[PDB]
Amino acid sequence: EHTIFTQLKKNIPKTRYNRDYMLSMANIPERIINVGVIGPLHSGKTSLMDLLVIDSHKRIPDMSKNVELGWKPLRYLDNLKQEIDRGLSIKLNGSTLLCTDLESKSRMINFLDAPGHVNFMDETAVALAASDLVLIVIDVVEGVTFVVEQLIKQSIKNNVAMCFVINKLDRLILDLKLPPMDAYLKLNHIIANINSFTKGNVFSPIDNNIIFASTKLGFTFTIKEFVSYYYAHSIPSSKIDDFTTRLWGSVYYHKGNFRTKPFENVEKYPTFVEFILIPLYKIFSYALSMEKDKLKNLLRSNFRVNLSQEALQYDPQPFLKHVLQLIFRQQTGLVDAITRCYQPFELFDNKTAHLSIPGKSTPEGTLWAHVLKTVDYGGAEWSLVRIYSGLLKRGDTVRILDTSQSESRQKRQLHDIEDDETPSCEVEEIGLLGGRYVYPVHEAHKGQIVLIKGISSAYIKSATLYSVKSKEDMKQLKFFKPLDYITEAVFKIVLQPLLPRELPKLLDALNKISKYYPGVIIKVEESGEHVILGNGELYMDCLLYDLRASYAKIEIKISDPLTVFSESCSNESFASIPVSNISVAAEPMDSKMIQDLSRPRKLSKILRTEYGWDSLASRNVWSFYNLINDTLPDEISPELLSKYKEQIIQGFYWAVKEGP
Amino acid sequence: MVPPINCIFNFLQQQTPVTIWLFEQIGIRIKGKIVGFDEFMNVVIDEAVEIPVNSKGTPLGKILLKGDNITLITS
Amino acid sequence: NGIPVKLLNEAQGHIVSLELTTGATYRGKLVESEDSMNVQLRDVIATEPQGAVTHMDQIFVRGSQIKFIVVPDLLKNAPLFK
Amino acid sequence: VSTPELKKYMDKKILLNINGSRKVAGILRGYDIFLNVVLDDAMEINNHQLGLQTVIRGNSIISLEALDA
Amino acid sequence: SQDDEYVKDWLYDSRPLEEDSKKVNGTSYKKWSFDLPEMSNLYRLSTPLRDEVTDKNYYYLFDKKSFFNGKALNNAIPGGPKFEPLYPREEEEDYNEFNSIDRVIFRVPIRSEYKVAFPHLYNSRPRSVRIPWYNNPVSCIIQNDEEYDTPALFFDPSLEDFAPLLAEEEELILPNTKDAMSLYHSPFPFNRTKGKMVRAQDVALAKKWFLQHPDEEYPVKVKVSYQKLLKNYVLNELHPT
Amino acid sequence: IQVAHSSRLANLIDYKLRVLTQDGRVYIGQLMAFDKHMNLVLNECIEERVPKIKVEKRVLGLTILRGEQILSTVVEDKPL
RNA sequence: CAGCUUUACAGAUCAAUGGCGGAGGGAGGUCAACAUCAAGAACUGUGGGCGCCUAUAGAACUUAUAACGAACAUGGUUCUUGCCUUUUACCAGAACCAUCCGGGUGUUGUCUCCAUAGAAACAGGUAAAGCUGUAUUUUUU
């Protein structure tokens, strides 16, 4: 049995599409989209995911009656006891869904509903890395917070298609009770904000990147989708795109058969408000308020939809939800939007480069895959790996490298420019992370994400697995860099086990935590005191819960929550003091420079000059890590003792790690 | 990008030598100067000359060649 | 909208076969299609009415001159139909 | 309605297979919704050149095989 | 007749809703389904008793879960109840090198408010501690002056022979719709408009008040009573029979 | 050959159809889907070509037959 | 204003094939009897492959800040407490357990109150309801 859970058997939720087809699709790249949905806390990404799952599937066991009705949200992908009981999506438990577009043709989609909360931004980062498009879901009410902006920035940095979901229209419709015009204005403002935070690409509801969602009430829609459903009967095929284009940007209808950019005096509101928002409002109000028969009649007439006799007797919110579902059909619009966003597959290469290094492509020569996050998906360890090229077969002998040993490997390769296979593992069982169930598969092809069982035990966090057949191939290959978990960790919780007897157990638990929670530095100090440097409070708490219940079940002492302090110097060093059985100076860097750092010798020198306008000699000498290390005496240019300073610099690294 | 209509317009402006190939007919070609322009590929072409293809010349006046049976244009 | 067109679109990616009015069969990975069957393929063979095969990299084909398009049997299973 | 997506084939040499078992060659300059090609002129399939710049009609096109990958 | 138009005829009857009607199952009186306006009227009537906070986030550290946590940790949220500790406080630290006042820093006072919020963190050796919630904020504005869709409490933003859908509607917001909206955000009892019948015994009108944070400037005795009530509730909740 | 007295082409979906074409070939197969412009989707298509003597046979599978090239369609057999 | 599918219609030859067919109730009772409602998120059969896979399917009810109750009592047992010093009767916590006041769902059976037809489609009309439609390069000019 288990308390933190998955399905545990082959009585899985059956799917409206057949899974064989999906599998087939997954064979060929270009017909796979890794979405990785992202947002702030409680924007409703998880809700959206759940909705999608529902749409996909026939009859799900976990979805009770209440959830079906609408009342409670089916939070599907927060399958963990914690992530349930707590209310937060805490770990990456996405899905693999064959999702259709406006063009009836269908494509498989690896969604990953990340955490919204800002202490699991490691998870978010991981998701981003995995995923090629990213749906940025936003609370309509809360709008574009700083968190959202940060997310956007991150996305921009690691090259990804940002298809926005403005979620929770319900809140503005009903909670705030904004007038339709007011709501429209708000939406516009939000869009503007988004644009501002974005570098270049202009997002609007036209072009199908903004997606208007209300994931509790159970509908997402891009204006295009809406048009397709409800402005085909009236408007002929030629001007449908044109009509769509017209809808949003401050144009009016003029009570007349063609639209006009100027404001008109007789009619009140813009086209978007008139042809979409107003309709939505009407639907809402009628659902809440109107005589049922009348509503039914309207549905029959306008939307061409019939309410069931059972569905009439529904309770209000549920009824409303049902109506919405009937109107805004099973969410294909969103999928279409996503597709539109990620019609460029030239970004993929860029993304890959960013992940690793400027790469020469070698697809047929070898299989390679970014192991992103370890997971305890179904109690047992799996590993969330994106196969980038090749195909990863079950029972394949595979070389793996933790991103810890990535830079070093690269350096070695460079130097080279005998078979040194350092570790490797056998693939036990491959599966598709389908939310609550792991639908198992034998192969795993390019440009898709999957759970693999054997890999986990090799690495600690974020690996690169590959299966070469040559020296040349090996040379060609590159190794994914360690995931920049955007939220750096400075919440220092010190541990000791309460019973020293079970220190091994504690150690094991710690290891597990490290594996699973990636945004977790675990320093095992000299004093027998383990230290966890978690991201924040809530995250830390969650980690503790996981440890002190699931991955150990041990009584454990815990300190007051401290931080990682870090030593520096205010002024420059005054005394030229040597050391014996070396004399090194000290001075702070420029604040701006430091900030830049946080976010070829000649080239380096040039960069330095650009940054702080320092001397060229200093630049030449410089060779830094983690901060800054120069070699600027007089005799060092003559001397060969000071020359060859890699070993020397290693020593310095220790100092940097553990200050005075 | 340079559209076909634009190209046609340019040709018209020029009044340079043009050599038209006929659709579903290999053995015969036309050679003249483009005078007209229409929404379709139909154009009026003064100083036209019929040419039998080398698998030389023949007499021919001023002509408008219909859009449906065009293959090649060049100028 | 045309259901055969939709089917063709869906088949995108797969190793489709393709004969013209001229009677010259092609067989290869489908790249892209449109409302009018404006097909593209990759890594494609080309056999004439005589039987002599000719390999070629990237071919585009116009729907008017296309006779019929053979898709693999996988798309019979699902899902645009119902 | 939709434009032919020939942005990959822009500024590349293409063997345009045209009506009556004929062929045209040349670098691709432009196009439109009717598939009327605009291309810099080359030889007709031993081999002989006509014209400087050429504009081919859509109906005549049987195929257009990319010479350059 | 104006305000309470619908309910008045039956409201005070032995069987609250008549027999042989379409609003209840029948004479067995086991299920009910109501129209909107009647429901609205009922809601309006019940303003004294149903006085509940529509904002769910209000109950932060007044959750059942929170109470349970407190009980476990022998840690009174000062407003809420207190119990005999689960575990006897074995004060046998023996002046160890961990959790010493030589070692730790005291910028934060680590209030017991924080204990039940992040139990597994701030509290050391937590046992039988349930996980609490961690919520979103509720911008929900209700008009008390009889007006319709108004940005009142908040501030404005900076910046072919057919018509739109639902044309010939002639009105965005129907006359009953404000009431409907109000109903929508309200809690369990009235949220719905169909239900199973509970026994008069099985309704709790006092409960809600004591679940809520107590109204301020009350006497000590009242507070004590409230606490007692909470304790009674909590224990019942905890041990499910 | 036996067949019900059908009214339209849409009403006889998934029946085993012979299909004649302008070039001379005869495509036999079950009609999966139709078009406004008479494009047919065929389930398990077999092309029968007659060179200038006897029927040369070729099995195809799932095929998208364009409407322009079709002459006419005969009902070869019922479903299943 | 065209097309096909269904009712309301004559009078048919009535084959052909379908579908409504051993064609016969409905609403309900502070009415029963039985089944079943805390388990690997968990359901039941059916054959087939051989206690387990693969297709069939079915599925009413209850459940995620986890439950039949938006509700809350009391027992019994140990252990620890407290008032206390004898016990009952008690304090308050724990762990197992039970009892109880209730709840559904399904199937029958009854009780009550209203009621009563054993055959209609085809050729197509008459009338009304469901959806589709509005020749110059890629479909049929």
Ligand SMILES: Nc1nc2c(ncn2[C@@H]2O[C@H](COP(=O)(O)OP(=O)(O)OP(=O)(O)O)[C@@H](O)[C@H]2O)c(=O)[nH]1
């Ligand atoms: N009013 C309104 N509420 C919503 C909507 N979508 C979700 N919610 C509610 O607000 C919260 C957001 O839904 P969740 O899916 O839990 O949020 P989330 O995306 O998982 O957030 P993370 O846990 O950070 O990933 C839940 O309590 C939902 O009931 C919406 O469209 N409108």
